[PDB]
Amino acid sequence: FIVKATNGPRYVVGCRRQLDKSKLKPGTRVALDMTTLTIMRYLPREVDPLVYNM
């Protein structure tokens, strides 16, 4: 998978072992490893509350 460091660059990662590779669709947010940098844990969220406040 190609991930998005929110200050910058883009990488190549993998899962831990069994992180449900069908769940990790383009559009999810994951937690990335510190050293290995690969995917650790999925998350929700999304962005600007001008959609939300209406």
């Binding site: 883009r10 990488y11 190549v12 290995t36 690969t38």
Partner: protein, 55 residues
């Protein structure tokens, strides 16, 4: 000199036939060495590669 020339042609022959075997073994060896070169260098794979640009 037909007792000593015919003695030593055999000698230098058996010498070179021994000496062939060294390079036969090294040719057996270096193909394995080149395969180890191939794969153990081509482990240069995706340690988590970064996206950039080429100019």
């Amino acid at each position: 000199d037909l007792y000593s020339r015919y003695k030593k042609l055999q000698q230098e022959l058996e010498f070179l036939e021994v000496q062939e075997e060294y390079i036969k073994d090294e040719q057996k060896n270096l193909k394995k060495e080149f395969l180890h070169a191939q794969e153990e260098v081509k482990r240069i794979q995706s340690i988590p590669l970064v996206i950039g640009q080429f100019l």
